[PDB]
C-alpha cells in the first residue's frame, strides 16, 4: 500500500485518506513499518507531504497527525529521520522550517517534535567538505541562517519546548558560529547577518545574565570573532569589533564605549581583551596575520583599533628591538667572517692553540657556534610547537662537527654558511619602510617567478649543449671541458677555438648564433618584462605588502619575549567602564582613539 | 627527447654510416634509434592526417625521418640535420608548459 | 525548426557561435519555456532548490 499512500499524499487530496484509520486498526500496522517507508532513504509520510504542498497549505498534515496519534506512534513517527549518506538526520521540522511555513512549525512543536535533532547528512556540510548548505545542524540555527526572525522568536520562547541558544552540534559550532559560517561580503547577506547576530546575542544575554554566549568555543577552539577572522569575513568582523549597546541592561557586553568629547574632538575607547592577548589565549591579531590563504587579509587589518594598536606597539617597543637585532646580527656576521678569514691554512683540522691569537680565533669560533646553535634551537622549537636561517644554523653546526672530526671539507661548507649568512642580511631590511617593500618584492619575485624560469632554462640549456657536443667529432671528459667553455662564452668572455675538429662548421656557427640569440634577446628580455608588469599590478599592493610585513615583524618580536615581559609591555589602560549585574566593577582593558568631526 | 639525445650522443664517430652492429651496446643504440624513428613517424602521421582531414612538430618529424633515410643511404650530413632535429626537439618543449596555468600564460 | 541546416551544414546556434554573436547565443543556450505544451524544446530546466541553494541542469 506504500505506492498508494505516496500517491495520495503527493496529490494532496483529503478524500483518498478516508478508510486508512480502520485499515490500520484492523491490520494493526504502524506508519513506521519498513513496507510503508521508502527503502531508498527512509522518508515517512509527513516529510513527503511537507515537501510538496501548495501556497503553504498542504491541508493533509492534521489528518496524518491524528491518525498517528490514534495508532500511538507519534513519538517515533513525527520525528522519524532519514537514512543514507546524503540526507542523514533530517526530520520533519527541518523541512517545515526550510519551507518558510510558520504554521506547520508551530503545529509540529505542539505535538512533541524533537527541536534539537541534528541533520548532519552529506547534503548539509561545508562547501569545502563536499556539501551544499551548512547551517549549524539544528532547527534554531537553520531558522537563524535562513533570515526568519519570527521563527527564531517563536522557537526560542515556546511553552511546549524551547531550544536554548547556547547549544552545540557535533562539530561544536553554535548558532552564532553558523551565522558567521554562512556570512558573505555581499551587502544583502551582511545586512541580515549582523541584525540576526545582534538580536540573538541580546536575547541570550537577557535570558541568561550570568553566562556569555560568545564565550562558547567549538571543537576547533575558536569563537565567532576568531572564526570570522580566520575565514576572512570582514562584514561581520567589523560589526563585532565595534559593537556598542545603548541599552543600559545589556551595555556590559558592548565593545566600544564613548569616553569624552570636547568640541569637534571625540574620544572613544575600544575593548581589546580577546583581540590582543599576551599568551593567555589565541589572539585575533596573530590568527589574522600569521595564517595563510585569507580572503581579505589586507583589508581586514584596516580597522579603527587594529591599526592604531600596531602603531602604538611599534612606537613603544617595536622599533628598538628591531634595530638592536639587525645590528647584533651584522656584528655576528662580521665576527664569523673574521673567524673564517683567519682560519690557519697550515696544518690539519683541528689545530692546536698555544698562543693568545689562537685564543682569539677560538673566541670567535665559539661565538659563531653559539649563534648557530641558538638559531637551530629557535627553528626546532618552532617546528616542535625561517627556512634560510635553519639552513644557516644546520650548516654552521655541521661545519663545527667536521672541524672537530678532521677534514678539509668543512672549510668549504663553513664558507658556504658565511655566504648564506650575508645572503639573507637583505631580508632584515624588511622592517624598514622605504627599502622593506623593495625587499619583500625581491623575495616574492625571486621565489615564484625565478624558480619557474630557472627550471625552464636548466633542461633546455643542458640538452642543447649536449646536442652541440654530440655534433663535434674528434666522451664524458670532452663534454665536461666543453661545457665550461660554452658557459664562459655565454658570459661573453672566451674564444671558440675548439671547433677545429668539427665537420660542417657552418651549422655549428648557426646553432651557436641561435643559442646566443635565445639566451640574450628572448629569455633575458622576458625576465625583464615580468618584473615591470608585476610591480604595476601591485602598485597599490606595495602599501599592503609593506603593512603586512611590518605587522609580521612586530608580532614576531612580541612573540619572542616571555610571558611576563609581555605583561610588562602590554598596551592599553585598565578602565572601569561600568558595574556588572551584581554591581562589581568590570575593570576591562581598553585602547583609546580620538577623531575630529565637523558635521556632528 | 632524453632517449633521442642519448642516441645522438652515442653515435659512433668512427666509421661511416650505416655502422654494423655486432655487440649488445650496438643493439642498445639500435633500440634508441628505433624508438626515435617511431616517435618521428607517429608525429608525421598525426600531422599528415590533420592536413588530409603543429608546424614545428611537423618540422621535427620530417627532419627525423630525413635523417634516418640519409643514415640508411650513407653520408655524414645526416648527423647535422639529426642534431638539428634534437635542437627543435627541445626548442618546443617550452610550448608544453602551455597547459600549466602559472607558466602557460 | 532548429533541426534544419543550411547548405553549409550549420544550425542557428552553431552559426551564431561561428559569427560571434553573443547576444542571441546566450539567449539560445539558456532558453527555458514555462508553457507546458512547448516545454519540450526548452534548454534549461530547474532541478531542485533548498534554501538559498538553487540547482538547475542545462542541456548540452
Ligand atoms: O633567539 C632569538 C630569535 C627568537 C629571533 O627573535 C631573533 C631575531 C628576530 C626577532 O626577534 C628574528 C626572528 O624572529 C627570526 O626570524 C629568526 C630566524 C629568529 C627570531 C633573535 C636573535 C638574533 C637575538 C635571536 O635569534
Ligand atoms: C643558467 C643556469 C640556469 C644554469 C647554471 C650553470 C651551471 C650548470 C654551469 C655554469 C658553469 C659550469 C661549470 C664550469 C666548470 C666546471 C668544472 C668541471 O670539472 C672540472 O674541474 C674540469 C674543468 C676545470 O677544471 O675547469 C665540471 C663542470 C663544472 C662544475 C661546470 C658545470 C656546469 C656549470 C656549473
Amino acid at each position: 500500500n506504500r505506492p498508494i499512500l505516496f500517491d495520495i499524499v503527493s496529490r494532496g487530496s483529503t478524500a483518498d485518506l478516508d478508510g486508512l484509520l480502520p485499515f490500520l486498526l484492523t491490520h494493526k500496522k504502524r506508519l513506521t513499518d519498513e513496507e510503508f517507508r521508502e527503502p531508498s532513504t527512509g522518508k515517512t509520510c509527513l516529510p513527503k507531504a511537507l515537501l510538496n504542498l501548495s501556497n503553504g497549505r498542504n491541508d493533509t498534515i492534521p489528518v496524518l497527525l491524528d491518525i498517528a496519534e490514534r495508532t500511538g506512534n507519534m513519538r517515533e513517527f513525527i520525528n522519524s529521520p532519514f537514512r543514507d549518506i546524503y540526507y542523514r538526520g533530517q526530520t520533519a521540522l527541518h523541512i517545515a522550517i526550510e519551507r518558510r511555513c510558520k504554521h506547520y512549525v508551530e503545529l509540529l512543536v505542539a505535538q512533541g517534535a524533537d527541536v534539537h535533532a541534528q541533520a548532519r547528512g552529506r547534503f548539509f556540510q561545508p562547501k569545502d567538505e563536499g556539501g551544499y548548505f551548512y547551517f549549524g545542524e539544528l532547527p534554531l540555527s537553520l531558522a537563524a541562517c535562513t533570515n526568519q526572525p519570527h521563527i527564531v522568536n517563536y522557537l526560542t520562547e515556546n511553552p511546549h519546548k524551547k531550544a536554548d541558544m547556547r547549544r552545540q552540534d557535533s562539530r561544536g559550532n553554535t548558532v552564532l558560529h553558523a551565522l558567521v559560517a554562512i556570512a558573505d561580503n555581499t551587502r544583502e547577506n551582511t545586512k541580515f547577518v549582523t541584525k540576526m547576530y545582534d538580536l540573538l546575542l541580546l536575547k541570550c544575554a537577557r535570558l541568561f545574565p550570568d553566562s556569555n554566549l560568545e564565550a562558547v568555543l567549538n571543537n576547533d577552539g575558536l569563537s565567532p570573532l576568531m572564526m570570522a577572522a580566520k575565514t576572512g569575513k570582514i562584514g561581520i568582523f567589523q560589526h563585532i569589533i565595534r559593537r556598542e549597546v545603548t541599552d543600559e541592561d545589556t551595555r556590559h557586553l558592548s565593545r566600544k564605549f564613548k569616553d569624552w568629547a570636547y568640541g569637534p574632538v571625540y574620544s572613544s575607547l575600544y575593548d581589546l581583551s580577546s583581540l590582543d592577548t599576551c599568551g593567555e589565549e589565541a589572539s585575533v591579531l596573530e590568527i589574522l596575520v600569521y595564517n595563510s590563504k585569507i580572503e581579505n587579509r589586507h583589508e581586514m587589518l584596516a580597522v579603527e583599533p587594529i591599526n592604531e594598536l600596531l602603531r602604538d606597539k611599534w612606537r613603544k617597543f617595536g622599533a628598538v628591538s628591531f634595530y638592536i637585532n639587525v645590528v647584533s646580527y651584522l656584528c655576528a656576521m662580521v665576527i664569523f667572517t673574521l673567524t673564517a678569514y683567519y682560519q690557519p691554512l697550515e696544518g690539519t683540522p683541528p689545530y692546536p692553540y698555544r698562543t693568545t691569537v689562537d685564543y682569539l680565533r677560538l673566541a670567535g669560533e665559539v661565538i659563531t657556534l653559539f649563534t648557530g646553535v641558538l638559531f637551530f634551537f629557535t627553528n626546532i622549537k618552532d617546528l616542535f610547537m625561517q627556512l634560510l636561517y635553519f639552513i644557516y644554523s644546520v650548516l654552521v653546526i655541521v661545519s663545527a662537527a667536521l672541524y672537530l672530526a678532521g677534514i678539509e671539507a668543512y672549510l668549504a661548507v663553513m664558507v658556504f654558511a658565511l655566504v648564506l649568512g650575508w645572503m639573507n642580511a637583505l631580508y632584515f631590511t624588511r622592517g624598514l619602510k622605504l627599502t622593506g617593500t623593495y625587499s619583500i618584492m625581491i623575495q616574492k619575485i625571486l621565489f615564484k617567478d625565478l624558480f619557474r624560469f630557472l627550471l625552464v632554462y636548466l633542461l633546455f640549456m643542458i640538452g642543447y649543449a649536449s646536442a652541440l657536443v654530440s655534433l663535434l667529432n674528434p666522451d664524458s671528459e670532452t663534454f665536461s671541458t666543453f661545457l665550461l667553455d660554452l658557459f664562459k662564452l655565454t658570459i661573453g668572455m672566451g674564444d671558440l677555438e675548439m671547433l677545429s675538429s668539427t665537420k660542417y662548421p657552418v651549422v655549428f656557427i648557426i646553432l651557436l648564433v641561435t643559442y646566443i640569440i635565445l639566451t640574450f634577446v628572448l629569455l633575458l628580455n622576458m625576465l625583464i618584462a615580468l618584473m615591470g608588469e608585476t610591480v604595476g599590478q601591485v602598485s597599490k599592493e606595495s602599501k599592503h605588502i609593506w603593512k603586512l610585513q611590518w605587522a609580521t615583524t612586530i608580532l614576531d618580536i612580541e612573540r619572542s619575549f616571555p610571558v611576563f615581559l609581555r605583561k610588562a609591555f602590554r598596551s592599553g589602560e585598565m578602565v572601569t567602564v561600568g558595574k556588572s549585574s551584581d554591581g562589581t566593577p568590570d575593570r576591562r582593558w581598553c585602547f583609546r582613539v580620538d577623531e575630529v568631526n565637523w558635521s556632528h
Side-chain angles (χ1 to χ4, degrees), chain A residues 1-3 5-6 8-10 12-15 17 19-20 22-23 27 30-32 34-43 45 47-58 60-83 85-97 99-126 128-151 153-157 159-186 189-209 211-225 227-247 249-250 252-276 278-279 281-292 294 296-342 344 347-350 352 355-358 360 362-382 384-385 387-398 400-403 405-406 409-422 424-432 436 441 445 447 451 453 455-457 459-472 474 476 478-488 490-495 497-500 502-534 536 544 546-572 574-578 580-581 583-600:
Chain A
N1 190 14
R2 170 222 169 266
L5 252 176
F6 277 26
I8 293 160
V9 298
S10 299
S13 183
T14 301
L17 294 85
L20 267 60
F23 169 69
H27 289 87
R30 300 196 169 281
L31 299 174
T32 186
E34 297 176 353
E35 58 185 5
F36 282 80
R37 302 168 66 185
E38 179 179 348
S40 178
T41 65
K43 185 186 304 189
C45 171
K48 190 121 188 65
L50 284 165
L51 275 165
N52 46 19
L53 58 85
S54 57
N55 78 342
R57 190 50 41 198
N58 183 315
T60 297
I61 287 296
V63 179
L64 311 173
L65 299 176
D66 301 1
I67 297 157
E69 188 61 21
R70 297 292 188 288
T71 65
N73 193 45
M74 184 172 289
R75 192 279 192 184
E76 288 74 6
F77 180 76
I78 195 168
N79 66 345
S80 304
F82 296 5
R83 306 148 161 172
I85 177 169
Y86 265 76
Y87 295 112
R88 177 174 46 181
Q90 171 171 21
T91 62
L93 177 53
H94 294 55
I95 294 172
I97 299 162
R99 299 301 183 180
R100 313 184 62 80
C101 316
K102 171 176 172 52
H103 191 267
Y104 285 114
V105 176
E106 299 197 21
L107 182 55
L108 267 300
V109 296
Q111 305 302 75
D114 183 6
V115 70
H116 286 283
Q118 296 187 8
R120 64 169 82 86
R122 288 300 311 288
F123 183 102
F124 320 107
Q125 294 287 51
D128 66 68
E129 189 160 337
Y132 295 108
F133 194 50
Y134 177 60
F135 63 87
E137 311 187 352
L138 282 156
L140 207 178
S141 83
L142 186 65
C145 290
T146 61
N147 186 14
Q148 292 162 245
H150 296 292
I151 297 289
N153 278 344
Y154 168 82
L155 206 59
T156 54
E157 51 187 4
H160 316 89
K161 272 287 294 191
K162 296 171 188 276
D164 57 62
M165 294 62 81
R166 54 193 172 80
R167 181 64 191 263
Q168 308 181 227
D169 63 62
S170 61
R171 186 184 298 267
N173 289 354
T174 170
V175 298
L176 306 186
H177 281 78
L179 184 49
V180 178
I182 82 190
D184 194 355
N185 304 336
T186 69
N189 187 351
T190 291
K191 198 192 191 358
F192 84 89
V193 168
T194 61
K195 175 166 79 68
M196 200 75 66
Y197 183 98
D198 285 6
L199 178 160
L200 195 49
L201 186 70
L202 301 187
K203 268 180 68 60
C204 185
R206 199 84 54 71
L207 180 60
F208 305 113
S211 61
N212 185 15
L213 178 51
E214 305 197 358
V216 306
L217 310 178
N218 60 18
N219 296 331
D220 196 328
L222 303 179
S223 67
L225 175 59
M227 177 159 79
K230 187 167 191 279
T231 315
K233 307 205 180 297
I234 174 62
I236 194 66
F237 164 72
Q238 186 178 182
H239 181 84
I240 291 181
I241 192 165
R242 74 181 55 161
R243 185 171 73 265
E244 45 176 359
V245 174
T246 56
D247 299 331
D249 185 6
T250 64
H252 58 288
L253 59 85
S254 47
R255 179 160 287 249
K256 170 197 181 183
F257 319 90
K258 312 293 180 52
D259 191 4
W260 52 249
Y262 197 98
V265 166
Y266 295 106
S267 183
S268 51
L269 62 91
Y270 291 70
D271 176 4
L272 53 71
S273 73
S274 174
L275 190 157
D276 185 6
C278 295
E281 70 281 8
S283 66
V284 173
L285 191 59
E286 290 178 346
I287 289 172
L288 173 56
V289 165
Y290 281 127
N291 283 18
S292 59
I294 297 173
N296 295 340
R297 190 181 203 166
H298 66 113
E299 206 291 331
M300 206 149 290
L301 292 165
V303 194
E304 298 296 338
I306 289 281
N307 196 329
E308 197 75 347
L309 177 52
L310 289 173
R311 186 96 59 71
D312 183 306
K313 191 177 287 185
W314 175 234
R315 296 178 304 88
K316 178 184 284 277
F317 90 96
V320 171
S321 183
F322 173 48
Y323 291 112
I324 289 191
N325 249 326
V326 68
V327 166
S328 180
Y329 171 74
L330 266 50
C331 289
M333 283 299 168
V334 174
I335 300 306
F336 179 31
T337 304
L338 270 282
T339 53
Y341 191 127
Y342 283 76
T348 176
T355 311
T356 182
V357 304
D358 303 357
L360 181 68
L362 293 170
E365 186 278 341
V366 297
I367 293 176
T368 58
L369 184 57
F370 175 91
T371 301
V373 64
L374 184 157
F375 275 59
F376 181 26
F377 152 66
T378 298
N379 291 320
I380 211 175
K381 182 177 70 57
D382 293 327
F384 186 21
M385 308 304 183
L387 67 169
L388 295 85
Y389 305 100
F390 189 17
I391 297 177
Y392 169 59
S393 60
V394 60
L395 295 172
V396 168
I397 59 176
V398 172
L402 295 176
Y403 162 90
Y410 76 115
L411 198 156
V413 69
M414 181 183 182
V415 158
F416 211 104
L418 180 56
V419 177
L420 211 67
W422 295 92
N424 59 68
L426 306 158
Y427 291 142
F428 264 56
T429 299
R430 68 188 173 176
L432 297 179
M441 179 54 66
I445 189 168
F447 91 88
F451 150 79
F453 283 152
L455 181 59
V456 165
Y457 294 3
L459 274 160
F460 167 62
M461 303 268 174
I462 188 64
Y464 191 172
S466 182
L468 300 193
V469 162
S470 62
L471 171 51
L472 177 144
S476 298
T478 67
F479 179 82
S480 63
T481 62
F482 176 98
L483 182 58
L484 172 56
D485 182 299
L486 180 66
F487 184 78
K488 205 173 296 190
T490 303
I491 304 171
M493 51 179 299
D495 186 1
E497 181 62 8
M498 191 63 180
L499 62 74
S500 64
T502 283
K503 322 297 285 298
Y504 266 57
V506 296
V507 68
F508 209 145
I509 300 164
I510 300 171
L511 284 181
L512 296 171
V513 162
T514 40
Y515 187 14
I516 286 177
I517 292 163
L518 281 178
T519 51
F520 198 106
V521 157
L522 291 180
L523 296 176
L524 178 64
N525 179 338
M526 268 296 181
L527 179 64
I528 294 169
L530 181 56
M531 171 52 202
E533 293 298 341
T534 51
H544 292 332
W546 162 83
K547 174 157 39 178
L548 185 148
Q549 199 69 356
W550 165 63
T552 178
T553 175
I554 293 168
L555 286 181
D556 265 311
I557 302 166
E558 180 251 334
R559 288 168 49 90
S560 55
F561 294 129
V563 282
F564 65 97
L565 209 179
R566 296 166 77 169
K567 300 295 295 304
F569 291 11
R570 82 195 318 287
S571 161
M574 174 182 296
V575 54
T576 296
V577 173
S580 65
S581 305
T584 178
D586 49 356
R587 302 220 62 84
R588 179 136 43 95
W589 292 117
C590 290
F591 178 89
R592 176 155 314 126
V593 75
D594 57 70
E595 60 177 345
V596 295
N597 186 313
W598 305 97
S599 189
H600 192 297

